[PDB]
Write a protein that binds this DNA or RNA. Structure first.
Ligand SMILES: Nc1ccn([C@H]2C[C@H](O)[C@@H](COP(=O)(O)OP(=O)(O)OP(=O)(O)O)O2)c(=O)n1
Ligand SMILES: [Mg+2]
Ligand SMILES: [Mg+2]
Length: 515
DNA sequence: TGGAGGGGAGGAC
DNA sequence: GTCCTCCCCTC
């Protein structure tokens, strides 16, 4: 019915449910990504400004580039020498490090491979990286996001998704202060829908009324992706998204004012579109993708099917083959080749996998789950694939890793020396989590993984005992030593020392709430 | 890249 | 039944 909204009361009311808000076509999701994160952390640690060309350095690689340094053409994974050729006033700052034989990490400022003095070197032979300064700042940001929003998923060290559903719903229905103009409040613009909601006489399966003309005065905060110049507010999804953009800006300002960090943000009805949108414009920007602009955005030429989370590896490449996708404009191709429903694509997939020709042992497509795959591709190609936000435990796993150069791990005694660093590092991380979150954090399972001189991988995992935080490092080392000596035996008569990599990972934890 | 963190399949136990 | 090994996803 073109006399009514495309959306129902059900879809609007479900914004107030944390468990179901994501499946609403009115969903309002934000993806927020810290700009040049490790470089910003170092900038703030060193009392530097947004104009200083900082780069964060790990061994000889630039692993984060401030926006000031980007103006010189410096890119992530430039070598430090390459970057110095591009910018005479560069401020390279090495990550913090642990020294082999010590049990604490620190910064050695003024030191690195670009320093002439051999007294101010940070040797790859005798140190390991600590990412803990970045992890600490990430946890501080997470606390601010969770204070502002009831459903936050940490997606990586510098990324979160927010479900703004409750905030948007509540603003839409109950906010009596928000002004659209000097003469018009949100409460008056929305008098019809609020009357209906408070009156309580709607049927959940009925469509909403067409939006009132007065709500078209509501503004989006940020950059609205709109190359075709479409009308900004035409249905209730736009209203919710505009309100969400106002809230998101306030949250991002809290991050900036409290921690000092600039962010980019993407706002849309789905996690996958939000993630693309947050990367569209940087630094310090919010890109908003309206439902009516989804195809304009997805087809702008920046993106392919492999741009979507889960599709950037081997499965994505198999799909390119299986679906005969072109090398460019694959998203539009999927949309137009199976234009009506996902059943069209499922039929195509079922035929491909039913062939005796198809190798189930090497494929990453589950032949029993082609309905799910077809729906996922069908909806992703339209910007309408809604995934829930998880919200994670305090920790799930914890790894300490050292890739080894030359003969720096040439025997079991060297292995154990590095394991001692790993155990000190992990125990310190666990202790910090226990204090910060008021928990008991108990490692249950440990995995040792290593690579030989010939790059062959050897792994072993198993249980670790628990005796309290004061014995944690010892308990971890006990298992580490057992596993490295077990693997040494397994490597007998084979190419082994010197190792090229050794790592320890606590792969399973128990977490106990206190208070 | 190195140095992370997430997640799951399936045979071993 | 759960555990261990190996593999695939991402920043
Ligand atoms: N392969 C990678 C990718 C990233 N990082 C680190 C350094 C980054 O600062 C941080 C977050 O990654 P992003 O991809 O968000 O990159 P930045 O925040 O540095 O830059 P942008 O402003 O483009 O987000 O993780 C890393 O160590 N190894
Ligand atoms: Mg970032
Ligand atoms: Mg990122």
């Amino acid at each position: 019915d073109p006399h009514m909204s495309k959306f129902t009361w059900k879809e609007l009311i479900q914004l107030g449910s944390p468990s179901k808000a994501y499946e609403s076509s009115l969903a309002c999701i934000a993806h927020i990504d810290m700009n040049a994160f490790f470089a910003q952390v170092e900038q703030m640690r060193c009392g530097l400004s947004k104009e200083d060309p900082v780069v964060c350095v790990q061994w000889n690689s630039i692993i984060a580039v401030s926006y000031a340094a980007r103006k010189y053409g410096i890119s992530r994974m430039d070598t430090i020498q390459e970057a110095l050729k591009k910018c005479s006033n560069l401020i390279p700052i090495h990550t913090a490090v642990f020294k082999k034989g010590e049990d604490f990490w620190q910064y050695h400022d003024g030191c690195g491979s670009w320093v002439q003095d051999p007294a101010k070197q940070i040797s790859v032979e005798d140190h390991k990286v600590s990412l803990e300064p970045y992890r600490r700042e990430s946890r501080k940001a997470l606390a601010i996001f969770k204070w502002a929003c009831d459903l936050v998923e940490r997606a990586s060290i510098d990324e979160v998704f927010l479900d703004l559903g409750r905030i948007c719903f509540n603003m839409l229905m109950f906010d009596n202060e928000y002004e659209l103009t000097g003469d018009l409040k949100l409460k008056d613009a929305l008098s019809n829908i609020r009357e209906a909601f408070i009156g309580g006489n709607y049927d959940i399966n009925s469509h909403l009324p067409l939006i009132p003309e007065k709500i078209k005065s509501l503004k989006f905060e940020g950059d609205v992706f709109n190359p075709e110049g479409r009308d900004l507010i035409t249905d209730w999804d736009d209203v919710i998204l505009a309100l969400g953009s106002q809230v998101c800006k306030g949250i991002r300002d809290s991050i900036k004012d409290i921690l000092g960090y600039t962010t980019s943000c993407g706002l849309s009805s789905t996690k996958n579109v939000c993630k693309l949108a947050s990367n569209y414009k940087k630094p310090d920007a919010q890109t908003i993708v309206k439902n009516d602009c989804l195809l304009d955005f997805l087809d702008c030429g920046k993106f392919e099917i492999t741009s979507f989370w889960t599709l950037g590896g081997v499965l994505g490449k198999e799909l390119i083959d299986v679906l005969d996708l072109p090398h460019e404009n694959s998203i539009k191709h999927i949309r137009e080749t199976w234009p009506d429903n996902a059943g069209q694509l499922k039929e195509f997939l079922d035929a491909k996998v039913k062939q005796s020709d198809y190798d189930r042992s090497t494929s990453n497509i589950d032949p029993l789950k082609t309905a799910d795959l077809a729906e996922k591709l069908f909806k992703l190609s339209r910007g309408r694939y809604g995934l829930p936000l998880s919200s994670r435990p305090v920790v799930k796993s914890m790894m300490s890793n050292k890739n080894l150069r030359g003969k720096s791990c040439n025997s079991i005694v060297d292995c154990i020396s590095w394991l001692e660093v790993f155990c000190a590092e992990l125990t310190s991380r666990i202790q910090d989590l226990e204090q910060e979150y008021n928990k008991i954090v108990i490692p249950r399972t440990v995995s040792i993984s290593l690579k030989t001189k010939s790059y062959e991988v050897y792994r072993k995992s198993g249980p670790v005992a628990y005796k309290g935080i004061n014995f944690q490092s010892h308990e971890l080392l006990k298992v580490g030593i057992k596993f490295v000596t077990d693997l040494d035996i397994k490597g007998k008569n084979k190419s082994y020392y010197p190792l090229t990599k050794l790592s320890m990972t606590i792969t399973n934890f128990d977490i106990i709430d206190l208070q």
